[model samples]
Target: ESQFLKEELVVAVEDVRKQGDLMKSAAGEFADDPCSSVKRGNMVRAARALLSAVTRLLILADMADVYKLLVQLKVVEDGILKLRNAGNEQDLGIQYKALKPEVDKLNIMAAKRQQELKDVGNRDQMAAARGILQKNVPILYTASQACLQHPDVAAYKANRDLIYKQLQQAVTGISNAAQAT
Candidate 1:
């Protein structure tokens, strides 16, 4: 069952990722197309589709986070059905609040992992950092899709630009990190 769920979640995430990519590509193509009524319509549709997919992707991530929280809550096996039936934000809010401590614990754990990576002071650590920076590209692309979807939403648009800028910084940081080692 766990394997099945992992597969399902992977598919869901990938589907949204693909749509986000398409929306981004369409936006670029639309920019070159002569500005006309028909082109504008296509652009709007693509933008809207991209926005919907990004929002959906974020929700998928939220659900995954909730699943992790549930396990940490020690409610995964027992009373799983009750937790799964949480149908509203209020229900999620309660569970999320309950799980905050565990989530904070994981943040600390991740920080420790990074610290461990740093303590090695090895070439391999720099190489791994470069790989992680490269992976940030797709994240930036997806965030761009969200911005295109709603330029009026300050957070979404700001995040899109921020991700893009971060990606560039990551590339440089990785290069410097790898060279410094």
Candidate 2:
């Protein structure tokens, strides 16, 4: 399963890399247009920046997948070790039940992420959203990192994680749009 997932990620990485290059090229062309307004130039620059950021995030996500795979393998190793040491069938059953739901949740989340990568409607609208997100994502990422620094409150960490997840979704959406062509 891990090998299959790794192969999928390799393909996804290539797809995203191509999409990012297209976005960068388009932004450059827009910015160089003789009739382009100042606002248009800025928007195109923002779009380019967003594309750069999204590309970075895609690479990071691939790295994360590698790490996650290693961690999961370790977990399986440890679980097997635990099961071997268990004195009875009831203990083994308990262990299986505990691990099953977590694995199920991981599978569900993976499917949702794959679904998120599917391109949606209105290319122009999606481009506009990417520009807006380019301007906003830095603020969101900074705020979340700041929240993580506030160790006094547990809610801060929770909020940070939530924002991080939102950032991930935003990047995926932009990538989907970029890949639509």
Candidate 3:
């Protein structure tokens, strides 16, 4: 059993490492693109790829968590095999749904953090946070749409996209305000 777990971990680590390499190349393209329409497109692609990597990692992590739970419950070892084959979106979504309670709790904490930043009274700090959020809006919106095809999912992409669009507008507003100042 320990050997099986170790092997599974090794495979997952290798898969995520490949994803990281892809993300790194994407990041480089984003950085090299001229600060124009085309460059922004490259950046958006990179952001989408990076988000995909994160989503895949999240699914793997959830699968690992479920495997541990099955072990604790003395469930059939087939649970481990099911986890090992969960390399696609559907399987990953099923596993992710199984872990939704925990995921939702974390998301709630993230929401609270966002609210705090939104309420931040200091101008520079708020602007900085808002700017970071602004640049990420497009990818966030696209990702939300992509993730919603799955049923029994906890982390919907709606709020993220909505917040991102709002932040984008806020950044424009900030620029306009600065022009006047």
**lDDT for model 2, on a 0 to 1 scale?**
0.51
lDDT of each: 0.51, 0.51, 0.47
lDDT of 1 by residue, 1-181 (tens): 1445556677777767887787777777777885767776776887787777767766665455434433433432122222223445455445434544443443333333334334356445445644554454445445555555565898976775666565445434433443331
Candidate 1: residue 111 lDDT (0-100): 34
Q: What is the TM-score of each candidate against the true structure?
A: 0.37, 0.30, 0.32
What's the count of clashing pairs in each model shown? 0, 0, 0
The C-alpha stretches of model 3 lying farther than 4 A from their native spots are 2-9, 75-181
- Steric clash pairs (candidate 1): none
Ranking by TM-score: 1, 3, 2
Query: In model 2, what is the error at residue 100, expressed in angstroms?
Result: 2.6
- Model 1 has an lDDT value of 0.51
Report the C-alpha displacement of residue 109, candidate 1, in angstroms: 7.8
lDDT by residue for model 2 (80-102), tens = 33433344456655655565454
Sort order, lDDT high to low: 2, 1, 3
Which candidate comes out best when scored by TM-score? 1
For residue 90, give model 2's deviation from the true position in Å. Answer: 4.1
Error of 1 at 129 (Å): 34
